[PDB]
Amino acid sequence: DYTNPPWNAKVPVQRAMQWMPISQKAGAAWGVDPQLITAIIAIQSGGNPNAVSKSNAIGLMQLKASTSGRDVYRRMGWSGEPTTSELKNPERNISMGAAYLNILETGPLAGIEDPKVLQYALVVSYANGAGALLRTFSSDRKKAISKINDLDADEFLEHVARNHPAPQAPRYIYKLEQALDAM
Numbered sequence: 001d002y003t004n005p006p007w008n009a010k011v012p013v014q015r016a017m018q019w020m021p022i023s024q025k026a027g028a029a030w031g032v033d034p035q036l037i038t039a040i041i042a043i044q045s046g047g048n049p050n051a052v053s054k055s056n057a058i059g060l061m062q063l064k065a066s067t068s069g070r071d072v073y074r075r076m077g078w079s080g081e082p083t084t085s086e087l088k089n090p091e092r093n094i095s096m097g098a099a100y101l102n103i104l105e106t107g108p109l110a111g112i113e114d115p116k117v118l119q120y121a122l123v124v125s126y127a128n129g130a131g132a133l134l135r136t137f138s139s140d141r142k143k144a145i146s147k148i149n150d151l152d153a154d155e156f157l158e159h160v161a162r163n164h165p166a167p168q169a170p171r172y173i174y175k176l177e178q179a180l181d182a183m
């Protein structure tokens with residue numbers, strides 16, 4: 001199951017808390033909880049700004065140029081996508097991750113009223129994609145939402161654990177909570 005193997009948030013949180021001044025800046029700019037940004041950093045890279053994955057996600061918030069990067073750039077009115085170089089810059093990385101969270105929050109995920117579930121929707125949508133999250137409820141965006149609103153955090157987490165194709169989906173929520181406890 002997804003609680004396995006357990007995760008000790010403390011050190012990843014210890015190194016992620018160092019960027020808080022930046023997360024506060026980025027968070028204010030994009031209307032995003034600075035701790036949520038910090039939680040993702042901790043879960044995604046453990047706070048190393050030079051992090052590069054197998055799938056080729058970059059930096060502190062582990063952004064993929066060709067998806068989240070492309071999306072933020074489009075939100076800005078810019079063509080193309082960020083270079084790997086930009087994304088290793090902590091500030092560029094964090095602001096762009098925060099921008100991506102606001103994009104999710106005001107696009108695909110618009111409509112979640114319960115902010116605790118919403119914060120759950122965001123970590124799963126961030127790490128595995130919004131559409132992937134939504135199609136576990138229905139192929140229609142608005143129907144998927146109305147269902148989501150009839151759940152409490154514990155229920156939404158249930159549904160994720162068994163109706164979400166990716167096994168890691170529910171584990172991000174767990175790591176999340178492990179990260180918020182460690183703040």
Ligand SMILES: CC(=O)N[C@@H]1[C@@H](O)[C@H](O[C@@H]2O[C@H](CO)[C@@H](O[C@@H]3O[C@H](CO)[C@@H](O[C@@H]4O[C@H](CO)[C@@H](O[C@@H]5O[C@H](CO)[C@@H](O)[C@H](O)[C@H]5NC(C)=O)[C@H](O)[C@H]4NC(C)=O)[C@H](O)[C@H]3NC(C)=O)[C@H](O)[C@H]2NC(C)=O)[C@@H](CO)O[C@H]1O
Pocket residue numbers: 044045051052053054055057061062063064065066067068069070071100107108125126127128129130131132133168
């Ligand atoms: C190595 C290390 O140190 N740590 C690893 C860590 O890297 C691993 O996790 C990885 O995390 C990153 C981000 O944290 C993951 O990146 C995800 O990947 C998603 C899957 O591809 C991606 O979802 C897609 O995003 C697109 C853009 O938003 C979606 O397209 C858009 O659809 C919208 C509606 O749905 C539409 O309105 C837009 O027009 C459209 N835009 C475009 C440009 O297409 C697309 O639908 C969506 N896919 C799905 C299925 O929903 C996320 O955007 C992307 N997030 C970010 C922030 O980049 C990455 O996938 C993870 N790695 C791997 C290999 O999967 C972690 C794994 O457990 O391990 C750590 O240790």
